Design a protein around this ligand. Structure first.
Ligand code: 1VU
Ligand code: ATP
Ligand code: BTN
Ligand code: MG
Lengths: 247, 673, 261
């Protein structure tokens, strides 16, 4: 499979309006070599996909969110499933590719009583500790602390890309407006200002949190080249016997 | 494509699909700004991104997008549109659209209102043909309202009987009756069908004709009274009364009959005062007795096949005559310059009722533009989706050549190199009908698809040599993948010791038969022994390209590897048909015998959804002991209504097909007992 | 009904055009190239991967919050490329945008490129033409210079740093080229001085022009700051391409060995 192969089918894979979902497995198949993908835990924690694939003949670990199941939210099972795979891939010198489409963590009293904080910290630790090269592509959205849990640029990430339909925000637009403009008594002009000011990849691109805004059709050729230059990545960290993962 | 003469400066096309792309391309040839309309779903179509400017005309459904006429006038008055082109279907033949366009300064590219009124219903067209020395199908003239009168009329006109409702049409309301009791049966069932569909109840009884070869003549006229006939087209091969394979030069007819048909058609066009481009359809029997079927006052979907033999662009002529320029060609200029055959690739499943429409996105899409004598008209692209709101149209594939055989060879080559991944197409059906023996010979009829496949389409019945070739290709592909799996980079710490396998022994399971295969590799050539028969397969063995070109015993073949699995399963497109094989090692095959089969809980008594769509009618109830052949429910999907029956007698346990609901493929809704 | 794609489009166009078409013309009239075509000439064709295209400054003082003072890219083009097949990281200062003077975003982009290069182990090539530091930016410019100096010192002896001065570098922008391994200048168009001639006249009461104060000749003949001088931008870039082949990519690699006939 040629490294510079284009994928025009991904230019409209993400629906233009938010409430509709799509299949991230389609994107994963379109991006990787020969559309071959060995999925790990395909029937458990369906809201996240982890697996092994190849880019330009080199094995890579693929981690992504699933908007089809649970609207892409993160929970205990998905956090553990992603964390173990990320830890293994980092331990055995396997590059990581991440596809981010997450609205946050799944709410409810069942998640709080189960220790959702511990498992979210597990996933965040797994992504933060990783030394192997990491490439991240934000497809549709990344809201709140989940955006940090999904290997953001500030977790010593190597390369971050955002599709033109992406948006990075602190929280939902309606919630942010109602929590910031309580004393203004405006829900129409302020809502429009927020929608066409911060519901877009431009705040992050201006802040430098994403290296570029790339057309989806060029994502594969955009990734392989990166994996060419990051093969010699080497970092140093303070000495320790072993760290204390929040298990 | 001379731009010296004065020509319109802005044209707004009022149609979607491949015809929109074709008309936009033709307009761009003459340096004309082109405006396009689209729904919300089709905002990312190829035609909107190819046109100069695109306007939304409402939501996704056709009723509020391409039938919202007021939206069309609003878009036109917003864009300063000089002209308008409706393509085919939709609003192409609407009198109200024509009068609304005539109210404004905009000009309608096509026939005037008078032609639409004349050809709207079969009664007026039939009487106009009768008074314009036109042969017509024999039978009573006028609307029949009494069942007894209908059966009597059937008695005088003849034993075969056909009932077709006035106006409407488009593949519905046509029934066949044989006896007088069957005549009245058809009478009241057609009355009920007309009431349900349109409510006109203007059904007409006529003398049915057997083996009605469907031929047509392309007529082109201008405002100055000059009219010409553009040779002919042959469109007999149909299912559900829609054409899928059609050919311009009809091999059945000869020169004198073609000239007579052309003169008669131009006389009819002069009588009706047709000043645009249109089609007139005839039903020729086995004795060359021509009969007027219908005249379409719109551009035909199979117009590309007749515009290549004549070597002209028809849309340019249509625009020129819409402007008012005189025709620049005469009847002596119309000449045949070879052969042309073309097929309609749909998004259907040919194994279900000769094509059951299906939905989905296009993961991969590639057309064989580089093959010689190939022309593709498609309104889709990689990433396009097929919804349940529009026709399951994929593409039109046209091949032109010197004669019939070479054109058919090019056509088969074109199907062999056509890549569609994401939806289910009917490429296998087209391949079978274009490689059929009688089709090659020429003996074809309207019911060709029905009587060649009495039990429905089954796929390519590959012969012994073709089976051996397919087995050899599959085994060579398996061995090539296994060999590629052993090519790692140099490690310098743990050197790789490549295995030395002289011969691969495989047990290939195809259909319900196990074949012993011995494969050997010598560079790029594979020697394969299948049950003692020797074959040589040579190829570049590129395992990433969707299309693989191989040579087996000196014969070139094109293969698409649809799927492969580590367990041994492999789906391969051979000769346009997808075959599933199971390739296993001899040791693995012999060890598989000691292993239990998994029980499947689908032993009949299961009524899932054959296609995704909206349920419109339910004929089942929990506890109903319906017999075989009873319709479980009726599903509407993108301009087709299907009522699947019951394969066995049983008592319904639970009904999950609640009325007014959308169900995907395989949605279990009835479980009989 | 979102115009985000169109906004991306004009932002790309504006970033590619830099500080303006007529300012590009004025910058051409003095025998100099723009940063983007400079990079296109320096690197192999079809190999430049740019980073941080949509980054601009943060300053909200002295009227820089206006839409007319928001330049995407912010006076520097940063990325990676290949010379004769070997990876390299490059940054080129854009003299059009605010005179090329450095701000928070400018130094942030350069620091990001330097960090990526030191992580991967590739050399850094810097084309320098800047009037100093944005005065209305504040102490953030001093912080950016300090970060650049720290990264230059940390990477000294680890990866080769090459500096090519192709414009009037002044103020604190002169310490970075002197902190690299090699410094190259372009004749009659590049200057290098800590303090301008006007301040020299005001303080020490003597008259000197820019050419004899910080020109290429006075730094390649009597000052010992620069190592070579080239006729023009094209010649300088070709000679730097020739010179890059001699050096190894990192201190972990041995001396390069080419094909000898
Ligand atoms: C560590 C402390 C420092 O960084 S000291 C910074 C130096 N102090 C100064 O006052 C800047 C003086 N230098 C300059 O103006 C030019 O760079 C010199 C070296 C004179 C080049 O000659 P010349 O071609 O005549 O410049 P120019 O008249 O075309 O000016 C073009 C635009 O560049 C701008 N510029 C330059 N430096 C800064 C700066 N530090 N801060 C803000 N803006 C700067 C100027 O505003 C000038 O703007 P304009 O386009 O002429 O309107
Ligand atoms: N009198 C007839 N005898 C035999 N077959 C007939 C007769 N009338 C129609 N048919 C069959 O029905 C098919 C439908 O013909 P026709 O073109 O009138 O249908 P339509 O789709 O309703 O019309 P149109 O394409 O003109 O809008 C014909 O191709 C032919 O196979
Ligand atoms: C609807 O969205 C597409 C209409 C396609 C028209 C089909 S194909 C040609 C036949 N003639 C006609 O009037 N309907 C049929
Ligand atoms: Mg017809």
């Amino acid at each position: 499979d040629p490294s510079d192969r284009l994928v025009p089918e991904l230019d409209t894979i993400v629906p233009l309006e938010s409430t509709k979902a799509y299949n991230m497995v389609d994107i994963i198949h379109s991006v990787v070599d020969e559309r071959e993908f060995f999925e790990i835990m395909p029937n458990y924690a369906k809201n996240i996909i982890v697996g092994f694939a190849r880019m330009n003949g080199r094995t890579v670990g693929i981690v992504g969110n699933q908007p089809k199941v649970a609207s892409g939210c993160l929970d205990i099972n998905s956090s553990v499933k992603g964390a173990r795979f990320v830890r293994f891939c980092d331990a055995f010198n396997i590059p990581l590719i991440t596809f981010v489409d997450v609205p946050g963590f799944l709410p409810g009293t069942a998640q709080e009583y189960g220790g959702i904080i511990r498992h979210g910290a597990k996933l965040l630790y797994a992504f933060a500790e990783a030394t192997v090269p990491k490439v991240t592509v934000i497809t549709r959205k990344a809201y709140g602390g989940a955006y940090d849990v999904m290997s953001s640029k500030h977790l010593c990430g190597d390369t971050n890309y955002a599709w033109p339909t992406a948006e990075i925000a602190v929280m939902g637009a309606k919630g942010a407006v109602e929590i910031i403009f309580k004393g203004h008594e405006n829900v129409e002009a302020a809502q429009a200002e927020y929608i066409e000011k911060f519901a877009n990849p431009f705040p992050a691109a201006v802040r430098g949190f994403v290296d570029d805004i790339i057309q989806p059709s060029s994502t594969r050729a955009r990734i392989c080249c990166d994996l060419d230059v990051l093969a010699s990545k080497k970092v140093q960290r303070p000495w320790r016997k072993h760290a204390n993962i929040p298990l | 494509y001379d731009p010296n003469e004065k020509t319109f400066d802005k044209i707004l096309v009022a149609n979607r699909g491949e015809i929109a792309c074709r008309v936009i391309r033709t307009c761009k040839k003459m340096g004309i700004k082109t405006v396009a309309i689209h729904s919300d779903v089709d905002a990312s179509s190829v035609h909107v991104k190819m046109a100069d400017e695109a306007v939304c005309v409402g939501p996704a459904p056709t009723s509020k997008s391409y039938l919202n006429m007021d939206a069309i006038m609003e878009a036109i008055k917003k864009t300063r549109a000089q002209a308008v082109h409706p393509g085919y279907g939709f609003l192409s033949e609407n009198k109200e659209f024509a009068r609304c366009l005539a109210a404004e300064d905009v000009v309608f590219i096509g026939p005037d209102t008078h032609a639409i009124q004349a050809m709207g219903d079969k009664i007026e067209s039939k009487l106009l043909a009768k008074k314009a020395e036109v042969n017509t199908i024999p039978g009573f003239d006028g609307v029949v309202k009494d069942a007894e009168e209908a059966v009597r009329i059937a008695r005088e006109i003849g034993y075969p009987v056909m009932i077709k409702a006035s106006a409407g049409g488009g593949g519905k309301g046509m029934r066949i009756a044989w006896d007088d009791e069957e005549t009245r049966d058809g009478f009241r069932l057609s009355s009920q069908e007309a009431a349900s569909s349109f409510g006109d109840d203007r059904l007409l009884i006529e003398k049915f004709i057997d083996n009605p070869r469907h031929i047509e003549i392309q007529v082109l006229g201008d405002k100055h009274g000059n009219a010409l006939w553009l040779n002919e087209r042959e469109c007999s091969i149909q299912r559900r009364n829609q054409k899928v394979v059609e050919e311009a030069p009809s091999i059945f007819l000869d020169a004198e009959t073609r000239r007579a048909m052309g003169e008669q058609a131009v006389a009819l066009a002069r009588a009706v005062k047709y000043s645009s481009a249109g089609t007139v359809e005839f039903l020729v029997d086995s004795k060359k007795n021509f009969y007027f079927l219908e005249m379409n006052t719109r551009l035909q979907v199979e117009h590309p096949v007749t515009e290549c033999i004549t070597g002209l662009d028809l849309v340019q002529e249509m625009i020129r005559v819409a402007k008012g320029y005189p025709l620049r060609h005469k009847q002596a200029d119309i000449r045949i310059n070879g052969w042309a055959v073309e097929c309609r690739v749909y998004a259907e499943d040919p194994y279900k009722s000769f094509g059951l429409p299906s939905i989905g996105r296009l993961s991969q899409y590639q057309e064989p533009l580089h093959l010689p004598g190939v022309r593709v008209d498609s309104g889709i692209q990689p990433g396009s989706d097929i919804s349940i709101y529009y026709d399951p149209m994929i593409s039109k594939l046209i091949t032109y050549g010197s004669d019939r055989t070479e054109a058919l060879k090019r056509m088969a080559d074109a199907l062999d190199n056509y890549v569609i991944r994401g939806v289910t197409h009917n490429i296998a059906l087209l391949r079978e009908v274009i490689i059929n023996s009688r089709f090659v010979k020429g003996d074809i009829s309207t019911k060709f698809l029905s009587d060649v496949y009495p039990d429905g389409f089954k796929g390519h019945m590959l012969t012994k040599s073709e089976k051996n070739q397919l087995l050899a290709i599959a085994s060579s592909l398996f061995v090539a993948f296994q060999l590629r799996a052993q090519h790692f980079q140099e490690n310098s710490r743990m050197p790789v010791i490549k295995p030395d396998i002289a011969n691969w022994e495989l047990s290939v399971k195809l259909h319900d038969k196990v074949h012993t295969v011995v494969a050997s590799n010598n560079g790029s050539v594979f020697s394969v022994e299948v049950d003692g028969s020797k074959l040589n397969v040579t190829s570049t063995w590129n395992l990433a390209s969707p299309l693989l070109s191989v040579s087996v015993d000196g014969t070139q073949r094109t293969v698409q590897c649809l799927s492969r699995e580590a367990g041994g399963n492999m789906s391969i497109q051979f000769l346009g048909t997808v075959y599933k094989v199971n390739i296993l090692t001899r040791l693995a095959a012999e060890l598989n015998k000691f292993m239990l089969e998994k029980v499947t809980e689908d032993t009949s008594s299961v009524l899932r959804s054959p296609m995704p769509g909206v349920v419109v009618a339910v004929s089942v109830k929990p506890g109903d002991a319906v017999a075989e052949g009873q319709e479980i429910c009726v599903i509407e999907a993108m301009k087709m209504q299907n009522s699947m029956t019951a394969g066995k007698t049983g008592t319904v346990k639970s009904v999950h097909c609640q009325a007014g609901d959308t169900v995907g493929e395989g949605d279990l809704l009835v479980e009989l007992e | 009904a979102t115009s985000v794609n169109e906004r991306i489009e004009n932002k790309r166009r504006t970033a590619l055009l830099g500080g303006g078409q007529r300012r590009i013309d004025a910058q051409h009239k003095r025998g100099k190239l723009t940063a983007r075509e400079r990079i296109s000439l320096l690197l192999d064709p079809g190999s430049f991967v740019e980073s941080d295209m949509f980054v601009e400054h943060r300053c909200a003082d002295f009227g820089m919050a206006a839409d007319k003072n928001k330049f995407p890219g912010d006076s520097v083009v940063t990325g990676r490329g290949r010379i004769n097949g070997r990876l390299v990281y490059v940054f080129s200062q854009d003299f059009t945008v605010f005179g090329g003077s450095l701000s928070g975003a400018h130094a942030q982009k350069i620091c990001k490129i330097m960090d990526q290069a030191i992580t991967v182990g590739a050399p850094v090539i810097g084309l320098n033409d800047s009037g100093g530091a944005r005065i209305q930016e504040g102490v953030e410019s001093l912080a950016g210079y300090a970060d650049i100096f720290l990264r230059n010192v940390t990477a000294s002896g680890v990866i080769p740093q090459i500096s090519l001065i192709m414009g009037p570098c002044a103020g604190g922008a002169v310490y970075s080229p002197a902190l690299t391994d090699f410094t190259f200048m372009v004749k009659d168009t590049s200057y290098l001085f800590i303090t301008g001639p006007d301040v020299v006249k005001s303080v020490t009461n003597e008259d000197v022009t820019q050419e004899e104060l910080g020109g290429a000749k006075t730094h390649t003949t009597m000052s010992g700051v620069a190592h070579r001088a080239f006729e023009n931008d094209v010649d300088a870039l070709c000679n730097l391409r020739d010179f890059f082949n001699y050096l190894p990519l990192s201190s972990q690699d041995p001396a390069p060995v080419r094909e000898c006939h």
